[PDB]
Every structure is written in C-alpha cells, then in structure tokens.
Amino acid sequence: SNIKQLYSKWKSLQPLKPEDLKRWNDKFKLEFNYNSNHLEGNTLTYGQTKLLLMFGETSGNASLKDYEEMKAHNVGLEMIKQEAQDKERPLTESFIRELNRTILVQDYWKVGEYKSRPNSVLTGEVFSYASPEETPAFMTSLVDWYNLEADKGILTPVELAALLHYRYIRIHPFEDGNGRIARLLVNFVLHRYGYPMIVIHSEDKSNYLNILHQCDVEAGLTPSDGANATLNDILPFVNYLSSCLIRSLTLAIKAAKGESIE
Numbered sequence: 001s002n003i004k005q006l007y008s009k010w011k012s013l014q015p016l017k018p019e020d021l022k023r024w025n026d027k028f029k030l031e032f033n034y035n036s037n038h039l040e041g042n043t044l045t046y047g048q049t050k051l052l053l054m055f056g057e058t059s060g061n062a063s064l065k066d067y068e069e070m071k072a073h074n075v076g077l078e079m080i081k082q083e084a085q086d087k088e089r090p091l092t093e094s095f096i097r098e099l100n101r102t103i104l105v106q107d108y109w110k111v112g113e114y115k116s117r118p119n120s121v122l123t124g125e126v127f128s129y130a131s132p133e134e135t136p137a138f139m140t141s142l143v144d145w146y147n148l149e150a151d152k153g154i155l156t157p158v159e160l161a162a163l164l165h166y167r168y169i170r171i172h173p174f175e176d177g178n179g180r181i182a183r184l185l186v187n188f189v190l191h192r193y194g195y196p197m198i199v200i201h202s203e204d205k206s207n208y209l210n211i212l213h214q215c216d217v218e219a220g221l222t223p224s225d226g227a228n229a230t231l232n233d234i235l236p237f238v239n240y241l242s243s244c245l246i247r248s249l250t251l252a253i254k255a256a257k258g259e260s261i262e
Contacts, residue, residue, distance in 0.1 A: 003242055006249040010196070013256040024196070024255040027262060028248075029053060031199045033074050036183050038202035044070055068105045073180060076103040080184050084192035090147040091188075093139055099181055100174045108176075114139070119172045129172035130223045138171045138227050158245055159231055161189035162238040166215060170226025186241065196252040198244035211240045 016024065034049045044066045051057045052067060053074060076099055083095055101112025110117065114135045121127045130138045146164055149155050155163070165182045172178045187197040200208055214236050219229035231238070255261050
C-alpha cells in the first residue's frame with residue numbers, strides 16, 4: 001500500500017534528468033560501499049571512503065587492504081549493474097565466483113573458489129552452512145532455481161531478491177565475502193527489474209541479523225532446510241528488504257523532483 005504508491009510514483013518519474021540521476025547514483029555508490037563493507041568489519045571511516053570513491057584519494061589512518069577491498073567492492077557493484085542490465089543473461093555460478101574473486105582482491109591463508117574447510121560458526125548455538133561436499137550441488141540448484149523463477153514471473157523482485165539472499169547466505173559457499181555477495185545479489189535483482197538499489201545500513205546490523213535469526217528457526221536448522229527455505233518461511237526478511245526499498249524509493253523520488261538528498 002505505502003510501498004506500492006511509492007513504486008508507482010517512481011515509475012512515473014522515469015527517466016530522471018541525468019543530473020538528478022547522477023546525484024542519486026553518487027549517494028548510493030557511497031552509502032552501499034561504505035555500509036556493506038562496514039557490516040563485515042571494514043574500519044574505513046566515511047570520509048576515508050568518500051574521498052576514495054569520488055577522488056581516488058586516501059586520508060587519515062588506514063591499511064592499504066581496507067582501501068583495496070572497498071575499491072574492489074565498488075568494481076563488484078559495477079559488475080552487478082552491467083550483469084543486471086543485460087536482461088537476457090541468466091544468473092550464473094561463474095558470475096558469482098568472479099564476484100567473489102573481485103571483491104576479495106586476492107588469495108589467502110586461514111578467492112573465487114567454493115569452501116574446502118567448513119565455513120561454520122558456534123555463536124554456544126552452532127551455525128551449520130553447506131558442507132564443502134554438497135556446496136557445488138546446492139549452488140547449481142540455487143542458480144537453476146533462480147532463473148526458473150525469473151522465467152515464470154510469479155515472485156515480485158523484492159521477494160525473489162529476499163529469497164535469493166537468504167538461500168545463498170544459508171549455503172555460505174565461499175570461505176569469505178558471503179555477506180557482501182548476498183547483498184550484491186539483492187541489488188542485482190532489484191536493478192535488473194528497474195527498482196532502485198537498497199542499502200542495508202551497518203548501524204542496523206543487529207536488527208538485520210535478528211530478522212535472519214527468526215527465519216532460521218522457521219525454515220529448519222540444517223543446511224538443506226536453509227537452501228530450500230520457502231517464501232513464507234522468510235516473510236520477516238521480505239518485509240525488512242521492503243522497508244529498505246521504501247527508503248530508497250522515497251530518496252529517489254526526492255532526487256527526481258530536484259530536491260536535496262545529502
């Protein structure tokens with residue numbers, strides 16, 4: 001109702017005047033890169049981040065690595081935009097792997113390859129992701145599933161995005177970067193279908209984790225149960241992404257009308 005009105009208004013303002021559109025895109029690039037990386041412990045400040053993405057300048061105290069991952073993640077964003085815009089290109093395992101390879105700049109000791117040692121965590125309540133053995137089978141199922149949903153056109157982009165994020169995050173296929181891939185995949189879906197991309201804000205991290213911790217109890221605690229989580233299982237997370245989309249739509253409409261955003 002509220003979201004549907006905002007969406008309708010957004011569609012009516014397409015296309016945005018390029019200077020209004022640039023302001024929107026600039027702000028999003030900034031906030032998405034900052035927040036998505038901050039959620040995973042990147043300690044670049046907002047200034048450090050902004051001066052990197054807008055001017056390629058470094059400032060204050062940091063590690064080269066923080067600048068590299070932040071920069072690589074932005075290359076990742078560009079990748080999903082281009083992949084999404086080519087509407088006839090189905091979601092591929094190879095694209096997701098290249099995404100991992102990209103955003104995590106280079107190999108490591110305990111990139112772009114599925115997990116070989118388990119990626120689990122004993123939060124005392126254990127978190128069981130896909131086993132290294134079943135991961136490739138689970139991933140082939142995920143992309144096949146996604147593209148089938150894309151064909152039959154029943155799910156809304158928010159729903160499909162939410163479920164893609166959830167199932168992916170439950171498989172947790174790579175040794176690292178799975179949080180950022182999940183969130184990149186959401187914005188892949190939204191961008192492809194003409195929605196403004198969303199920013200899960202790192203200030204809301206506990207809420208974000210909480211919402212997914214509710215879904216976890218609903219779907220089933222095994223790695224199979226996560227991979228096969230239904231839409232009705234993940235309803236609280238569908239609502240969560242919708243509230244983000246409400247924020248994006250409101251800001252984007254504001255930009256289209258020439259009003260201030262920053």
